Structure formats: C-alpha cells, structure tokens
Design an enzyme around this catalytic site. Structure first.
Site, PDB file in Angstrom:
ATOM      1  N   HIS A   1      -6.413  -0.872  -8.301  1.00  0.00           N
ATOM      2  CA  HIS A   1      -6.787  -1.729  -7.182  1.00  0.00           C
ATOM      3  C   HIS A   1      -8.302  -1.940  -7.153  1.00  0.00           C
ATOM      4  CE1 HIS A   1      -8.902  -1.392  -3.344  1.00  0.00           C
ATOM      5  NE2 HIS A   1      -8.189  -2.454  -3.013  1.00  0.00           N
TER       6      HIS A   1
ATOM      7  N   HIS B   1      -4.291   3.031  -7.070  1.00  0.00           N
ATOM      8  CA  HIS B   1      -5.500   2.633  -6.355  1.00  0.00           C
ATOM      9  C   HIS B   1      -6.712   2.478  -7.274  1.00  0.00           C
ATOM     10  CE1 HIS B   1      -3.221   3.479  -2.674  1.00  0.00           C
ATOM     11  NE2 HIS B   1      -4.107   2.684  -2.106  1.00  0.00           N
TER      12      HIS B   1
ATOM     13  N   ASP C   1       0.826  -1.204   0.000  1.00  0.00           N
ATOM     14  CA  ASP C   1       0.000   0.000   0.000  1.00  0.00           C
ATOM     15  C   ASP C   1       0.861   1.255   0.000  1.00  0.00           C
ATOM     16  OD1 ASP C   1      -2.430   1.198  -0.157  1.00  0.00           O
ATOM     17  OD2 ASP C   1      -2.986   0.878   1.961  1.00  0.00           O
TER      18      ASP C   1
HETATM   19 ZN   LIG Z   1      -4.593   1.831  -0.096  1.00  0.00          ZN
END
Ligand SMILES: [Zn+2]
Ligand SMILES: [Zn+2]
Ligand SMILES: [Zn+2]
Ligand SMILES: [Zn+2]
Ligand SMILES: [Zn+2]
Lengths: 367, 367, 367, 367, 367
Positions: D257, D254, D171
């Site tokens: 993601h 992201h 992350d």
């Molecule tokens: Zn994240």
C-alpha cells in the site's frame, strides 16, 4: 412455564375422500349441516349427499353466502337449529371454513373442516384473523379448541389454480423460521405455552418437505393431477404448517405480512404471497446465513412467490410505504416482539428495503 | 388408502401443573367428576379442589375401585349423572385413565387425562386394553375420539419410582421401529389409514429423544427431581409415543409383548419392560443392522430394561414357552402381520431364541 | 442495545518479565507505589527495585495489609499521596491486585497489575471485590476502566503451586459456557451492553485452549517449568477468561459458585474449584448434550478439579445444603437470570443433585 | 520475546449512540473539548451538546481545521486549556480522530474517539500515520496508549457513502493474512512483542466476518440503513481490524500500500482500496493456495474493490511505476521484512505484475 | 417365498470373439445349425465357418427369414433335423436370437446366443416377448432355462449404429429402479421367487456402470471403436440388465413401455428409447428424490434418449393417448402392480404428464 401443543382430533387426506365423508363423520354426530362453498357444491353436492345417505346420516346442505359476517353466521344457525343439527361441516375456501368454525362454536357442537384449496395454514387451527373492511389487519380471534376433523380431498385440491398451492407454500415456508425464533427467544406460542419438542419437529418437517417436494408438487398442480410429491406438500401446507405456527409460535414474517396489509398496493395478493416476503424480511432482520437466505429465495422464486416489493405491486413511494408497513409490524401485541432481541420500526424498515434489494439481485443473477 | 393422524385435542405438561387444572379445564365444562384411587387423591385432592374452586368450577370427588370393570363405570356414571357432571377428569395410572376415557365415552362428555406416571403410551390414545384373568390378553377395544385434554405434571412424575420411567422408555423405544416397519409394508395404522409424514416424524423424534436424553432423565428420576432431560423423556413417553404408535403403526414388538403374556413367568414385570424385549425380537426378525441392534440393546440395558429372557424370569422350559409366545404373537388380528413379508410362528420362534442369545452376549462381551 | 467490549490497555506475558517492568511501566508514570504482601515482596522486591532504578523511575514500597477493604484502600491512599505517586503497581494475588485497581481509580492514576499466580480471571477485569475489615464479603466495586497494563511472568507462575493453575483452568472453563448462555438469552454483559462478536470469539478460544493445552500445561505446572502449553493456559486463564466473562457474560456457573460459598464445608477450596462444579451444574441445567457434558467432566477430572460434591467436602446433609446453594444462586442480582428462560431454585436444586450423580458415575466408570 | 496485545479501553457501537455519548463519557472527566469537522458538527453538534448537558457534563465545541498539523494541535490546545478541559472527544473522519488522539496525549488527558465512518483501521489504534506533502508514506508516529473509549454510531456510519464502507472492508481484509504471516515468521507486532493467541483469533474472526457478512452489509450500506450484517462489518472494520493489525502484525499488504502512494496515479483512491490490491500482491508473494486467492479476489470484486492496477488508475508505464512501488515497499522500516523468509524488491515486483494479471483474468471470466 | 436367481450358463464378451466361436462351443455339440439374418451372415458367415471347421465342428448355415413365427421355427426345425444338428447358434439381432432360443427348446437341444448389437436386455433371458400385429404388447412367453452360452463380440457391436447402444442404455437404466421397487414391495420376480442379494447387486451395478461409463462408451460407439468403457457398457446392457430384470423384477418402467406401444406414434423408436421415458415415469410415480430424477434425466439426455413425449413423436391429443398408455400399463398381468402400494391408472396418468413436464423443463434449462 408449561409446554402446550394443540391439534385437530383427526386429520385425513386422500384422493376422492369426499366419497367417504359419511363414514368418517358418523362417530361425531347424526344430523349435520353442511356450509358449502357455492363452487364446490356446483360440482360435488351430489356426491356429498350420497356419501352421507349411504352412512345413514341426515344432511342440510346450506350454500355459503360468501362473506364470513355475523349476519351469515346467524342465518346459518337458524337453518342448523330448525333442522336440529348436532355438528357442522364446512367445505370449501377459507371464508367458508372460518364461518363453519364460528357457527359450531356458538352452537357448542363439533365441527368438521374440509378445505378444497391448500392456500393457508388456517384450517387446522383454533383461530381466525379479524380484518377491517379496508383490507388491513386487526386482530387474531381465538377459539377454545381446534376442529374435530380435517378432511382434505387431494384430487379436489389439485384442481385449483396452481397459484393457490404456491400461496400455501408461501404461508408454510414461514413456519420453521418463526417457530425457530420463538424457541430461541423463549416466546409463548398461540397455544399458550412454550414450544414442545413435537411442534418444533413438525415445523422443521414442514420446511424440509417444501424444499424437497415444492417444485415437483407445483408441476402436478399445473397438470391438476395427484402425485406423492403433491400429497406431501398438501400435508405440509395444512397439517404441518397449521400445528407448527399455532404450537411453535409466530414472529417477524407474519408481523410483516400484517404490516403489508396496512397499505393498499398489495391488497390484490394472497396471504401466502405476502408472508413469502415477510419470511425473507425476517431472514434479513435476524441476519440469517447467506446460504439459508439464498435457499429460501430460490424456492420462493421457483414456485412463483414474490421476492421483491414490485412483485407485490409496491412500486411508487416505496420508503414512505415501508415506514407504514414497519410501524404496523411493530405495533402493540404484534408477533415481531417474539424475535430474539426484539425489533424496532427502524430495524424492520431496514430489513424491508434490504430484503427487496436482495430479491432484485437474485432475479438479476438468475439471468 | 387415506392417510390419517389422530391426536388429543391439547397436550400440556409442566411442573406443578395440577395447580392450573382449573383454568385449563374450565373452557371444557364447569361441573366435573374427578376419578382417582386412594393414593392419588392422598396428595392431589386438596390442590385439585382448590384449583377448581378458584376457577369457579364444581368438582365431585369419586374414589376409584382399582379396576376398569363395567361395574365400576356404571357406578361412576351414577355418581356423575347425580351430580350433573359435564366432563370426567381421570388422574393417576393406566386403570384410572382408561376408566375415565371409557366412562366419558358412554356419557358422551369430554374427558381430561392427568397421568401421574409416564410408563405407557396409553394416555393419549383412543384405546383401552382388554385382558383376561391370570392371563393377560384379549383384544384392543377402540374409542371414537382421543382425550380432549392430557395434562402431565412433571413434578408428580419425578416423585414416582424411577423403574416406572424405564418402563415408559421401553414402551416408547418400540415406537420408531414399529411405525417404520408399517411404513415399509404399507400397513394400515390404528388411526385407520396409511402413515402421515407427520406421524413418522414424531415416531423418529421419540427414538432420538430416548437416545440423547434417556440416561440423563434417569439420573433425575432416581433423585426425584425435574430437569429438562426428564421433561423431554416424559414428552416422548407420553405424547410422541402415543401419537407415533397409534398413527404410525404397531408391528412385531407389541405382538411379541402380547405373546409374552400368554406365559405366566413374567407377570411381575411391567408393560414396557416386556416391550423392551419385543423390540429386540423385532430387530432380529427384520434383520436390523448390527449397529442398530447394539444401540437399542445398550440404551435398554442403561435404563435397566431386560435384554434377555432370564431378566423377565423365564429360565426354564424356554423352547416350549417360546413356542407359546410365538404362536400367540402370530394369532389372527395381531400386528405382527404388518412386518414386511409377514412373519410365520417358526420365524418369530427363531427371533426369540436369537434375540435372547444376543442379549446374553451383550451383557458379557459387549458392555 | 449497544454492543460493548472492555479490555485492559496492554497485556504483556513472558518469562522473567518483571526484569522489564521498569521499561514497560515507564511511559505511564515516574513515581510508583508498589503494593504487595510479605511473601510476594519477599521474592520480587529486589528485582522490582532494580528494574525501576535502571529505568529511571522512583519506587515507594507499600506492604499490603492483607485485605481488600475500604479502610485498606484509604490507608494506601494516604501513603500514596504523601509520596506523590503518579501510578500504582500491585503485584501478587487477587486481594492485592484488586486493592491496587480500586486505589488507582480513587486517585485518578494509571494502574499496573502483575499477577504472580493465574488462579482466577480477576486481574484483567475492571472490578474489585471489597471485603469488610474482618474478612466477610461487602460489595462488588465496579471500576470505570480496566487496568492500564497487565504483566504476567510465566516463570513466576510456573513456580507457584500447581493446584492454583488447575483452579485457574476451572474458573476459565466456565467462560465459554456462561457467555454462550448470555448470547442465547440476550443478557447484558458486565460491560453494559450485548455481546460483541469479539468477546464471544475470545470466550470460545479460551475453551478450546483449555481442551487442547490443559493436560499438557499441568505437566509443566507440576514440574515448575515453562513450556508453550503452559504459556497458552496462562493466557487463557488471565486475558481470554477475563475479557470473556466481563464482555461475554456470567450465568449459572458463577451463580452456583456463590451458592456453594454459603455452605461452610467447601470453605477450604478455591474459587475455580467451586466454579468447575458450577459449570457442570449449568450444563445439567441447560440440558447440554451428553457429549458436551462428558468432554467437560473429563477435562475437569484430568486436571484434578472437583466434579462431585464430596470432592468439595460436601458429604453430609446434602439435600439440605443444596437447597441453601440453590436459594443463594437464584437470589436477587445473581447471574442465574441470564440463563435462557431463567432458572427457579427448584430447577437449580435439581441440577445440583443430578450433576453430582453424573460426576459420581463418571468417576466410577473411568476407573 | 514477550507476547503483547493492546486495545482501547472500551469499544461501543450501536445505532443512535451519539445520544448516549454523555453517560458513556461521564466517568472520564467533567469538562470536555469536542474537536469536530465543520460538516460533522452540522448534524451532530446539537445532539452532542444535549447528550453532554443532560449527563451533567460541560462541553466546549471547537471546529476542526481539516489537517492534523502541529499548528492545529497547538491552536486546539489553547482553546482547551483556556476552557479548562479534562478530556478530548474527536468526532468525524480520520484526520479529526488522529488530531484528537495527539492533542489528548500532549495535554496528558483521556480521549474519546467517535468515528463517523468505518473506512480504516486507524481508529482504536495507538498510533498516527505520517505523510509527506506530495502524498507519499513517511512513517508511523506511536502514542503510548490506545484511546480510552471508541464509540461508533452505526446509523451515522450507514448514512456515509457506501464506497467508504467498502474501503474499510479492503483495509480489514488484510488483517488476517498479515497477522498470519507475522505469526509464521515470528515477527514483532506494532504492540512491541510476539503475537498472542487472542490477537490471531481476532484477526481470523475479522476475515471470516467479511466473507460471511460483507455482501449483506453492502446491501444495507447502499440503502443507508442498519442491519445486523452492517453492524458486524463495522465491528470488523474498526475493532477487529484495529487490534488485529496492531497486535497481530503488519506484512506485505500494507507495505505494498505504501508503495502505491509513491506514485501519483492512485491518489484519488481511498486507503483501503489500495490495501485491497496489496493483499492480492501479498497472496501471490507468499504463494497462497489457488482457492484462497480466488475467495479474496471474489469478495473484493463483490464489494467494488480494485483487483487490477487499472482499477487504481495505474494504466501507463506500468513496469516503471511498479519498480517504484516495489522498492518503496522493501525500504528500511517497512513491514515487508515480516514476511516468512522476507522479500527482495525483485520478488515484490514479480508479485505486483502477477497479481495484476490474476485480477485481469478473474475479471475477464466475469461474463 | 423362495429366493431364486437365474442366469445363462456362460457369458463371454470380447473383441473379435467370433473367431473363437468354435472352441467355446465345442463341448456342447459336434453338429451345429447357425440361424443368421442375411445381413449378418454377409460379414460373419465366412468367419463363422472357419471358426467351426478349425474346432472340428460341423456347421449348417440356415439364413433367417426375418420374423420369429411358428412357421419360421418349423421351417428351421426341418433343416436342422435333416442335417442332424445337436445344438442351435443364433447370431444377429433380437428376432434372430429369439427364434434360435425357441427352436432349441422344441428340439430339446442346447443353444448359443451371439448378439451383434447391445440394444436390449432380452439376450440372456429365458423368455420371449409376444406382440400383436398392430404393434401392441401381448404377453411374455417363458422358456424353461436361459441360453447355454451368450457370446458378445464387442468389435461387431461397436460397428453397429450408436443409436442402438444408447437404446441399450435406456433399457439397462431401468434395471436398478425396477428391481429396487420389487425388493421394496416384496414382489415376485420373473424367475419365480423373491429377490436374491446377488440380483440386487447386479441391478445396482448396472445403474452405476451406466452413470460412470455411459458417456465414455457413446464416444467410442460413435467412432465404432472398442474402449474399456464401451465394453463395460455392453456388459451392463446385456448381462447385468439381463439377470437384473429377470431375477430382480420388473415394475412401472416396462409397464409404461408396453403402454406406449398401445399408441402408434412411438413406433419408429426402439425398445430402450420408450423404456427411457418409462423410467422417468416410474421415478415420478414412486416420488424419487429430486437429485435422483435429475441424474437419470441428465444421463438419458447425455446419450440421446427421450425425456419428453415429443421426443417419442407423441405430440397431438396427448391426454387422450396417455390415458390409453395408463390403462394398458395397469392392465391385468402387467408389472405395475409390483410397485410399492401398487398404482391405479389415474396415478400412472398423473405420472406420465408430470414426467413429461419435468423433461420439458430439464431441456428448457439446456441453454
Ligand atoms: Zn490500513
Ligand atoms: Zn399465515
Ligand atoms: Zn405399549
Ligand atoms: Zn470466577
Ligand atoms: Zn426391456
């Protein structure tokens, strides 16, 4: 506070220098007692006595009993007094030299130290490590002054097993990292003051000398011959590492070494081999850069020093054992507290296991 | 040959350290002879008496005749033999310290040296300097041991005239180039052997300390205050210079200094003020790179040292005088023969005239 | 120890940003007490009222007594309880913003801070400097949290006197050197712990931003226009400097600054102007390299900050006044003990005289 | 626009810091509600109650249901209001912490966030992440302010599974590349404005920390011990990654993601593991230099993160599943538009397949 | 001393240059004697006679016996005098060229040297090398001047066995290290004085050329074709290696070569192959930096040169055979004394065994 540097008055090293013991020792005294290692004397007593006679001195050759006990000190003092000796010369291994230093102190006479192996930084120092009969650390025993003369015969030293030279490399590899941490933390050195610029220079010279000449010196030692690389490593192992640790400070590496003696698994290993792992433990503790730890790990493995706990025969009950090692390192009066910020037994215990895990990966990636 | 390094047994420096002379000197003896000149004991006698008193030491004050003559040594030896003195403590300038080191040699007792100025590298050495009358050279009188203890009070040194610290920077600036030249040539050092790796590292550290801290230390010296830069230069002027010159080697810079004393013009200039010009001479003699000469010339001018012959009050009959200097510098037993390939007086003559030209241009076009 | 970093909840920065104070502050509270002096409310009140009205918020204007005293906080408390304010907005300079910060603490309500100048690192901090009613210092009041919101109008800051922006650069320029000192020595920050990696990142970001945008921002400053260099120095002067000192640490520079306040000569000079000379003093005290000292003195001179004592109007009886500054800086609780190794008054006295000598020579040779 | 940087008020991290939870939380409130998962309270409750009680605080222990639902928030709101609670303390994983932060918002009370794992950047942020019930990304729910205190016990985090620390590295590894992208494009950050200099320095510091300490930290994590490298990585995983993504901006990583959650294959993989492949996808998309892609690919693989789709269990019907991910990433309200020049779903589809081929080859040359 | 650099009058190299032998040799004499080995005249005679005849020259072809003996020189002197020859042209390998050079000296006529292989530095030199009949080194026989012309046909040299070009690389590889050693020590070169700057630049250029072109040249040699890299290596093997060893000086490398001829094991190996191990021995002896030794060891192995004793067929009774080599190298009249600080037979013995261990390890890590 004050800044203090201590040194032996004279450091001499050269090939076949024991032929010149008489000429070098004559200014100090005329009547000498020689506390000689039995092995050293078996092959060199003839030439030592000749060196003294040709210089017009008187010798009392006294074969060393083997142990640095008070019995042996007393016995030797009697010989020295009966012969009216004005200075002591110790020649041989560490126990020999530690005895000569203790003897000359009690007699208030100058001392000469002639190491025949380059395996610890003890010779030049004004110190003595006191040990319980179980093999566990006890205390540092200090002396009012360093040896008057240190004389290193590089040809004799080249004859020893190469493992002894590597153990000296291990004890000397720590010098820069522990002095550097004492400088960062404003710690007090064993000389009693803050760091001088000179001591930190020698400690860093020591580290660089081992990087540049450690592997080449190891090659000469295996052949038992003298090359300039060997000469430089012997000087790093003896003078540089001696003045460096005494006048630059001890820190985590030697505390971890003292901690390792609190378990019996690594009793059959030399000082410098345990210090070698203590250096690696200090580098984790102080979170050294990855490039720094890889260099130290690589040189250590390149000369046969242990970089994992199994290489010191610590293989079962590792966690339980590392708690004992860690608590011992952090004891009162230990040098671990000279680390910048200090260290807790939980912190030293962590670094032990992590240094070990790092050493294991390095041995895997090397294949 | 063997490799040899010599050093005082202990070197201590710090602010107001005279207050701790008692505790530092106690493990050496109990009954002491304090040798100093009227001025030195004017500000020190009270604190010296008190420090020795609180430590349980017997102190015997003995004012100094001002010169290092044999009559003064016997006279002081009498006062010391009468008071049953166990050790000699010299406090003050070169003459006092050379006297204390020479006296304690004949009495066969330890010595402690407390320099109140950092103007030469003499304090740490095992050496006096034997001279003539009106003229200023005879020989180097050697000693068997280095001082047992050297204790430098940085607050005292900060109160001295700043010109004396520049003299120290001059004597110390020569250390690296002379020891480097002896390393290049295989010259025997005054410790009796070849260079140790350690001696060369302290000599280079001396040079870099003057480069990085020299001008900062001068700011403090002229305000008579102690700053870290001042402490570093004091250590370079005293310990790094003393060990580096004696165990690293002497070369052309001190030979040219010694020749500069064969003429009368520069008698009113200090030792390290004439060494400053002998360093530049050697850099011309050995054909040092221009960036190296300029760096040494610029630092020297920044601290007020002479980089020309007129700054030493040599302004008339220069060639005839420089021929005397050159011939003196190449005399038998002088250290100029340690230069790689040696040096003929024709070549030293050349180097003197060209060095003087360089400085004249530096003061003009290059500042 | 624990590592702690403290920050304001929101830092907002932009030109003509007070026009959006209503929509920024709306989610915090609906009824707001606006504290400000006559001058600030003179040009800001109408705009604040418009922005708050259009956003649907209720304003209670509360003109500021002029002092950040306990009695002035209590007075504003009564006013704020009677109007049932849900939050406090302080707008203007230090003493106002400090009063609004402490007031909202004792009332348990959010606070917004709207600096109209960027002259110190105070706005973002969780600290109020409390003065007596007559104007003398009283105590440092530590608040439990930083301002919920800090809103800096770059155009308003561009309109202010450029000497104020240069004072901010002075206060910010100490950030990196004081926090780096605290990291070396392991000091505890005003946030109650050791250094985070983040605080030291922002501290060094501050220093490089002053080096790279300082001169360019002052050009925009003296023209009362906004350029990106000005917007960066404002951020460095407010947020970077603020988190930098509070979570990075204070050391010699701010200690020396408090000592300068004891001397009455520099009374008509600003916080950052005295701090600027405190930074120079710390660099001498910690023996920073000449290239570092030169860079800092050069940037300070470029923005008009004082690098000598006479630029702080300290021209007569200098040695006596410096002994007072040195004593005041080494007092109990003063941040000089966060130096590596600490500092004695005699050391701070020395640094003060040498830093002044350095700036004098820098001024002389730059011309 | 305005430049804005948000942050939690106080960030604290340290080993065994839950023992000090009480003193740290003292100034916020006297009566606390502790939302804890049943597992977390198993080892923590006893210690928490003692830390609170000794600090003179009053605690109400409310076990957490498991999900961050409105029914759970309402149920906990009841317990808190009945027990007259002044603040909320969440302690555990993401869902606990997200619940605590929402509950405190509705009650209008302060919140303290004590994460027991460092697997995501969501602690410290002023937001929640909303999801469907199939597992696909819904939206972000924005809170008005960041938590009042974030307290991270590093010893507790070291006890967690090491896979979770690596998920935090995955992350955090995106923070710099996405903030740099937003800076380049001039996008608006989640904090409402343009990037400040402070946020980009924290974003870049995050990346460099993971490069320099990532592997050393995974050694200590896998031994469940605390070393300085593990502490630096936790700070990067939590604080640096937190401020960096919220006030530095999100972009393609992201976004990609969230696409991977539109397909069911990667459901058994943690948040940071899928972000890891999103970072590689972004690096192809923006055409990062081949040395930059490799450094990121190498560090990911060094800590166990996926660098191919098969390592996310995406192995069948890949071009189909990637078109879904591509359009999901490019949807309205996604951050893919923050990329310089934006990105069409065709372009993201290209980057997904190409990044996969890159990682497959990186892995193939792991022999 | 005087600085002296010798050289052949004209050095010519090119492909198919024996076609131009006539025009190049025209100004020296009208009537030539061509000393050629029977093999060399097999392919060259026809071409030589046409080149001479077309140039208006007159040639007398005298086939070479095979050995450089006085009886062979006298026999050829007869043929030349009867045929009224004005100059001598040798064409072929070393013994032919050495014979030609001696014959021209006794007749007092010019000489042209056309080497058909580039395996040694002896073409271009003003000397011969005298040997016993067992194969052991005797002495050097000095001629008054270097050859008048050296003409190297690169196409002819490319047709030779590639092992011979590698033997030339081994000979040339020592040029820089031995000239650098002589410069360091101030030794006298074979040309009678001290090193000139010109000779050290040619010595160093030789080393750099072999590093940069050595492997590219061995590609073309093994295909027996001419590329610019093969031409550069031939120039380094012949001219640079020639002037470099004669006017740059010899030291330990060739001394150790002569020792290896004192034992019969390495008789099947060419001159340069044994010099190759001599260079490694010198590099241990002078303690070259570990990066320098490896670069030389690597280049040697890259072109097939021996870096261990077993690769010189020295495999049995090694310490015995090496003591012979050591004392032979250290004999009177050998160049080992040109080493800085000289070298004892014990030191050379050390270097021989250690160099061998180094190469064995270099080879072991070739996996
Ligand atoms: Zn994240
Ligand atoms: Zn040790
Ligand atoms: Zn001198
Ligand atoms: Zn300030
Ligand atoms: Zn040869």
């Amino acid at each position: 506070m004050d800044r203090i540097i201590q040194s032996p008055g004279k450091y001499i090293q050269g090939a076949d220098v024991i032929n010149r013991l008489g000429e070098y020792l004559k200014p100090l005294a005329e009547r000498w007692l020689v506390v000689g290692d039995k092995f050293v004397l078996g092959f060199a007593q003839s030439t030592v006595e000749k060196s003294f006679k040709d210089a017009g001195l008187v010798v009392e050759i006294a074969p060393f009993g083997g142990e640095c006990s008070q019995n042996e000190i007393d016995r030797l003092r009697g010989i020295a007094e009966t012969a009216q000796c004005g200075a002591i010369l110790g020649i041989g291994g560490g126990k020999t030299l530690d005895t000569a230093k203790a003897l000359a102190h009690f007699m208030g006479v100058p001392v000469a130290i002639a190491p025949t192996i380059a395996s610890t930084d003890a010779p030049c120092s004004a110190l003595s490590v006191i040990y319980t009969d179980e093999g566990e650390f006890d205390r540092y025993l200090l002396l009012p002054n360093n040896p008057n003369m240190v004389i290193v015969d590089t040809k004799i030293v080249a004859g020893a097993p190469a493992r002894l030279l590597a153990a000296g490399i291990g004890d000397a590899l720590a010098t820069w990292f522990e002095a550097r941490a004492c400088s960062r933390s404003g710690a007090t050195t064993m000389a009693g003051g803050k760091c001088t610029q000179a001591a930190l220079a020698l400690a860093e010279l020591c580290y660089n000398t081992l990087l540049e000449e450690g592997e080449k010196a190891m090659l000469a030692a295996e052949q038992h011959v003298v090359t300039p690389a060997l000469e430089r490593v012997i000087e790093a192992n003896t003078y540089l590492s001696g003045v460096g640790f005494e006048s630059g400070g001890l820190a985590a590496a030697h505390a971890v070494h003292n901690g390792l003696t609190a378990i019996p698994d690594a009793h059959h290993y030399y000082h410098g081999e345990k210090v070698a792992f203590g250096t690696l433990t200090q580098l984790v503790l102080e979170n050294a850069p990855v490039e720094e730890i890889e260099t130290v790990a690589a040189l250590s493995h390149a000369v046969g020093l242990p970089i994992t706990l199994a290489q010191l025969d610590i293989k079962e009950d590792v966690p339980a054992k590392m708690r004992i090692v860690a608590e011992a390192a952090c004891a009162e009066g230990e040098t671990i507290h000279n680390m910048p910020g200090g260290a807790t037994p939980d912190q030293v215990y962590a670094a032990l296991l992590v240094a070990d895990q790092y050493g294991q990966r390095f041995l895997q990636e090397w294949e």
